[PDB]
Amino acid sequence: PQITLWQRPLVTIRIGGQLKEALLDTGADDTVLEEMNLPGKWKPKMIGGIGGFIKVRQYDQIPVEIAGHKAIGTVLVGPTPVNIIGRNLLTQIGATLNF
Amino acid sequence: PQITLWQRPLVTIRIGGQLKEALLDTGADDTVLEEMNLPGKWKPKMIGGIGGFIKVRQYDQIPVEIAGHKAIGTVLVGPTPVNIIGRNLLTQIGATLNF
């Protein structure tokens, strides 16, 4: 699909058997989701945003379905204003910016 | 052009006569540039994201050229680690997300 940017590029994703809304974020290196329980062991990590650094839980090799497209990678869980799908997963589904 | 996401989507922009490298960000509502003394009236504003909020100065109707594509709009200037071109300017250059 082709997505215009008049509205936030929010799409439905499936993760851990649950449905969630996430922003397709080209300005994010990583994928960060709001606090939720995910199967598997997690490692403490710190990432930076516009307002500073936050502590997150790092989950590896997690399958995520983005608008029907499959991806399996690192997912971070922590205090974020919105769920974001970063470049680590966007590259897996072949997402590109065009103009 | 078509931009892949293997690396951060950084491109050259021109604002206030200066050439800069900025991140094309679909996850940014606004365009935020690192500290620079632009002439003109501005209004104080607060924007947030991961880590919290930061204070920025809002400048309106500023001409910005993104990869040869002209645009004009609101630009925020504050203590940001990177220059970010948000949706307010991306829509003007007909930028879309494709996968």
């Binding site: 922003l23 990583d30 990432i47 | 960000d25 947030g48 991961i50």
Partner: peptide, 5 residues
């Protein structure tokens, strides 16, 4: 990682 709200 820049949302910007």
């Amino acid at each position: 990682n820049x949302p910007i709200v």
